[PDB]
Amino acid sequence: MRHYEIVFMVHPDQSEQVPGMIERYTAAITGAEGKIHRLEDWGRRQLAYPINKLHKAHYVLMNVEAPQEVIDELETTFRFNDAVIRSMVMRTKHAVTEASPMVKAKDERRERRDDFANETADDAEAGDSEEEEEE
């Protein structure tokens, strides 16, 4: 299809929600027959400059493959939504995306840049899921 490097970040106090936003979108993409190349969350970070009276935000990288209608449908939700502080979607037709070159960018972050801190666990905990075990 087409490949979309979606980055968006969410305002701290509604960030504690965020796997629920990701779980809504990822079913919205894969239910339109897309595929999730990857979901790396980047955690809570301290902004380079304040964005409309806010100093920190929580960053999420989705790498969607999907048709053109679907990315458009995500943007209309992102537009009317308080939760997102700012959002970006990049590119369109690269098959370089499929072979997932940001698998490494995720690991490079884990080895040095992204480390243990309180704010990025607070953001993870809403979606806490226990629906696996054999009966």
Partner: protein, 74 residues
């Protein structure tokens, strides 16, 4: 000789093709003054294609609030 094909890394300041773009932050900040703005190709020695492509990756980053837009008050 015949097909050993470029083990070495030392040349141009851009021998590898910088295929990580706006996600390697520490690589970007090597090209950013302490006043928070992009430096020119003559000073960094980046080949011109890569340099135009790096500028795009820095602007991408600035709008994402990864990099200082300016150093203003920072």
């Amino acid at each position: 000789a015949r097909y050993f094909r470029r083990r070495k890394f030392c040349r141009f300041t851009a021998e590898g093709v910088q295929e990580i773009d706006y996600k390697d932050i520490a690589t970007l900040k090597n090209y950013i003054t302490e006043s928070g703005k992009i430096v020119p190709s003559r000073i960094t020695g980046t080949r011109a294609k890569y340099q135009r492509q790096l500028a795009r990756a820095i602007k991408r980053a600035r709008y994402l609030s990864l990099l200082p837009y300016t150093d203003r008050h920072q």
